[PDB]
Amino acid sequence: SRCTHLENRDFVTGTQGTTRVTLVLELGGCVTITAEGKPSMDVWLDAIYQENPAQTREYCLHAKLSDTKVAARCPTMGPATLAEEHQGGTVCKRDQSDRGWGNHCGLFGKGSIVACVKAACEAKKKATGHVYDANKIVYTVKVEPHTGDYVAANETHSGRKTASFTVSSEKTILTMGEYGDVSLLCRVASGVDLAQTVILELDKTVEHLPTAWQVHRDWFNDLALPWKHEGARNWNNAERLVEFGAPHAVKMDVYNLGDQTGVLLKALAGVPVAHIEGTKYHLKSGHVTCEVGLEKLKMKGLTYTMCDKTKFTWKRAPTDSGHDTVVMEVTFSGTKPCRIPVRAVAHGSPDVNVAMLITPNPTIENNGGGFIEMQLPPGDNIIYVGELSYQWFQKGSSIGRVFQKTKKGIERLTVIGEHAWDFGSAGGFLSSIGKALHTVLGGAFNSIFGGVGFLPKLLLGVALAWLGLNMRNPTMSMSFLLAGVLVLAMTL
Amino acid sequence: ENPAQTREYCLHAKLSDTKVAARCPTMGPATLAEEHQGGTVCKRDQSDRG
Amino acid sequence: ENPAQTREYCLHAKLSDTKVAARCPTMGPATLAEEHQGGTVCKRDQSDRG
Amino acid sequence: LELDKTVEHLPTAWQVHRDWFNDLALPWKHEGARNWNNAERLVEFGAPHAVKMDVYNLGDQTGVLLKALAGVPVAHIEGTKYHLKSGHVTCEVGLEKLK
Amino acid sequence: VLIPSHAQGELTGRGHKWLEGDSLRTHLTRVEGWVWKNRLLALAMVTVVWLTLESVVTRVAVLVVLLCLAP
Amino acid sequence: VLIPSHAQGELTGRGHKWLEGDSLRTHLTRVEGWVWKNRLLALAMVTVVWLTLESVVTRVAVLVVLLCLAP
Amino acid sequence: VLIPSHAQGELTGRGHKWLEGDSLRTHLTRVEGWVWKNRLLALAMVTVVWLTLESVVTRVAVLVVLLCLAP
């Protein structure tokens, strides 16, 4: 399973009476779905990219100065015209030096002087911004069932089907081998906010750098560097990298501000990275809402039997997942294939099996089977696999795991979670009331401030909270109550 | 004329022979021969082993 | 039956190959090849160069 | 924790706690790791006089560890099995087939 | 040349990201740079607490502000 | 990773310097960063003045400080 | 059976004792051992100051005890 290759793993159970479930497929999580009477599925978003989209303003971080000429004149001898002023990608600045007779004048005073350069750029020193067109954007969702085989990260899984979701193809069916079909409907428009996202790009051929980044729109449109387009020859505002010193009556010296790469890299603290696999410009973080239909699925191994009790041996040690499940792998060298007798009693009653399974109906195939995963209540637990058993203590608490689900219910509610309340499925007065409370909330609160940052958020929140104490009208003292929201909410 | 030069500094870094080793939690945490060599930058961390 | 081990701790240390170097105050402060060899403990300090 | 078991007049294994174990400021390493991590603890320095600072060898720690220390338990080794001497385990005992 | 940081956006992130562990702690090293290297002026800040108008709420709202003024 | 500026140093000068008409005005252009990008906050600091404070002398000490604190 | 340390004879100081002032700050770095490793207790010693004592001058000796006393 791919969900056992990473940290962020969120279980979403499937009740009987509700078989079409809406998810949120973030990028960097893996949602395991366990439907009763249906094969449990692992669903995750794989990649978000676009095959060579449009690009915006580029920025040159290292100005290539060339053809540096200075015109100077005696104070009343005609402020000198220069032909170099009238091309683009040229920077000029008028100034009043003090001509002497050390440079062969007739009078003294404010000698007029002007210098000019041709502000070119250095090779592969462009800060290329990109934008998204949803015509070529692809959301890739790979789904892997629990076939009983475990597959590594460097390996590939044979039954791992892959669904691409453009905005044009928003309804996709995937035959999951013998398990059946899964119906997937992902709305690309109701996902990553593509409008306020700039993909920045430096030299991708430099080895030890992130290839692309994922920065803000109005942040990017107000940088203070030289800026050209795709295929532009002239520059605009190139006097930002070019700073003129004070002259000494003949040569006003011109100074480059060198490379500004690390300057920009200090401005990317808290950015999500973005991979570039040549053509594609991948994102590494995002979100989308999909719908998972499991009515066209069914189990595998219902016309088989329960296995032997004896021929199970531990290939693999039952250990905790870090997400309160116990994984294993058996070596069954007998009557294949068959339903593995997986059962796990508790402490206090050895009668009742309490093995909340994650791989339902495990079968040791003629070339497959073995991987079993189960969730258990706290306490001592004897996980039987036939005659073969295993002493286990579930280390999580009873209220601790429910509180862990609340912890996920807190830390999921960052800016990803501001759009994402589809962790449930058609709640009516539960889910849609969450949208009713939070869509206007996050919709207005991100609109205000323009995005301002943790320091000014935890400054201005405390500022308005201090202004709450100095309040004229107690009926209008709910501005303090507004200020209280402006401290605690935006600390994620 | 040619005074005694103090601390030099490096502004643009040259990075090569990138060597990474990882271990399990309780199977002898990761070491390298280049951890203790000169001109080498290392940082010990903990992964999430599946 | 022989569990895994964790950190081992040397009780009685052993020192050898001790190399000492100093420099004048403004004549390029001291270095050694054993400043960045494995299992080598060093300390930079200010002496009083007469 | 295990010191030299070949020393005849000592215990063989011991039993101590992990938190204090990571609070040990002795130089440490792992299985196969050649050099000692935080080796500046059994090695200290002094003040020179313009030429030679003498990096002093500092010696042994068999006493500070085990001999001036207030209320810690022990264990045992017999060959290739690291025994214990303290312990507890919950067992259910069904006498139903006895007579 | 000016660039403000991407502290304004801080848009998403559940994959790989930059130095957010030491992004807010840039300033926490700067202000401690104002403390550990200007110890005389750091002890000059005590002359506002127990000598000037020490109104309870407006002590810290002057102190931390004045410490974080110096860039 | 941070190099502090020569806001601190400021030794001497009758020769030539880098940016003497911009060192003081880098921060002023940054204030324009917290105004032009944040015109809604330019309106949000108005309600600080006439609806909350009623403390005419200390109003400037609120406004200017809350702008300059924004880095 | 322990051997006490010789901190009750200090004889001279012109040659070379083992450790200079750092050995005098063993019980001033172990106190930071009390601070950084017991943040629960480090915050628990604040409720003694401003809720139970009300004895501003004599609070200093109370802050020294229960931190520097125990090893």
Ligand SMILES: *[C@@H]1O[C@H](CO)[C@@H](O)[C@H](O)[C@H]1NC(C)=O
């Ligand atoms: C995957 O990595 C493991 C770890 O060393 C290795 O044993 C295995 O052969 C690798 N498989 C592939 C296909 O790279």
